[PDB]
Design a protein around this ligand. Sequence first.
Ligand SMILES: CN[C@H]1CC[C@@H](c2ccc(Cl)c(Cl)c2)c2ccccc21
Ligand code: NA
Ligand code: NA
Length: 497
Amino acid sequence: REHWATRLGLILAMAGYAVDLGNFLRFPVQAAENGGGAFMIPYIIAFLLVGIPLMWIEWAMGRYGGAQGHGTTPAIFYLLWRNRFAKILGVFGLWIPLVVASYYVYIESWTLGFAIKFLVGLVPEPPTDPDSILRPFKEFLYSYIGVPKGDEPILKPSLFAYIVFLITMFINVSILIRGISKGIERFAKIAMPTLFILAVFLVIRVFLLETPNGTAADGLNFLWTPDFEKLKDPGVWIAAVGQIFFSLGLGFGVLITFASYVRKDQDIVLSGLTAATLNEKASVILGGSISIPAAVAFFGVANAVAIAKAGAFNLGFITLPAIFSQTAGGTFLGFLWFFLLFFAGLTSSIAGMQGMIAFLEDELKLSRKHAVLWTAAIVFFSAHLVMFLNKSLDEMDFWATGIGVVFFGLTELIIFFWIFGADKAWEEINRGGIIKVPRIYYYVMRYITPAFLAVLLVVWAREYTHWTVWITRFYIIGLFLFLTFLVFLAERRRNHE
Ligand SMILES: CN[C@H]1CC[C@@H](c2ccc(Cl)c(Cl)c2)c2ccccc21
Ligand code: NA
Ligand code: NA
């Protein structure tokens, strides 16, 4: 079996997975709409009661199953719980990341495309007034995506956007085809420093932004200013819990797959806590000091709520490029921005597609070349549903990463800590640990964490379309069935040998 080369590379690949666009865009927006700096109160709490424990558990299940040549949850859930239903539940942790991949790489391709467009100067040049600056970039993006002009739910992406997507995929394959150590890890040692560099440079440049409308200090002011009255809102306490899942990457079965390349007695306690911290520092320090400040600085704190309510996607693909077309040499800033975002995705999409690659290697005994190509061929095909069917993206994401990861996360808890047994699990986590997990986390992992996951699981089901959504539902259900069939073939090949 493949293994990570250096302890550093492990943490960087682990941090590379969790460090993403959401760090720079989604996190700053959620904080601004949920109490500013007061949002740190329920967020830090959720980082402690939910995010850290669940991460250790996936590191635990990962390493536990990796020692036996199995990196995926259809196998690992059967090792924690020898059952017919356990294999079926494990399919989700191979289904989820395959669904997300169908649309993540595509969104990743966009940043690559914009980075290229910005670098060569192929960007809109307005003109005065805010809607006079934003509209040229709102249209620039929509011509790239192919946003429907008519009533039809059909997207018509540019030939360029499509080609970059092939190129983007090709880039992903290159890294994945070289393996865990000479590929993902080797890249994680290049990307993460390069990432941090671009991040700091933008932070420095952003703090030097001054307009008649405001300064970067006003952005950091508005953003981090605590609104403790919003802490009364349960929804804020829910946004915090959902965000932790999102930021860390829990419930994607990727940590489990990635941790399955960690050696049997190698530390997973401190290493994970490091990668977890790298992601958080990336968010509160680097991320919340570029996007929100730069917007408030240019449009004034009088629009700060309007900008936050405009969404994270707008902030990074429409709002910030429009601001860069109005700054000194900002055509190159546009490039550094979309190139910062490209790596943030590439370090996460190589981690996402490994779950399928691991399954084809471990369970169907395919070579690494075939496992990588066939996974690519599957992702490339399914993305056409995302590229051409309007709102197909929202549908896949809602199920996979809105209900799916939260459900599957509570599944990992119960299977590893209630079915497999808490004591056997607790030992599995602490073993080989440089530092030992605090004795108090035994109770958190057993009650508090699955409680939080459960009471959240109740509200997102109580709180929550066209007809074309059935097309996407049809396809992604058909994915689950097909993956059930491969798990079935995997267990019929094993009885013969
Ligand atoms: C974990 N937070 C980021 C990390 C990578 C990125 C991600 C996660 C899983 C996969 Cl399978 C892929 Cl391809 C990509 C992602 C997706 C959705 C939501 C959040 C995030
Ligand atoms: Na994150
Ligand atoms: Na990443």
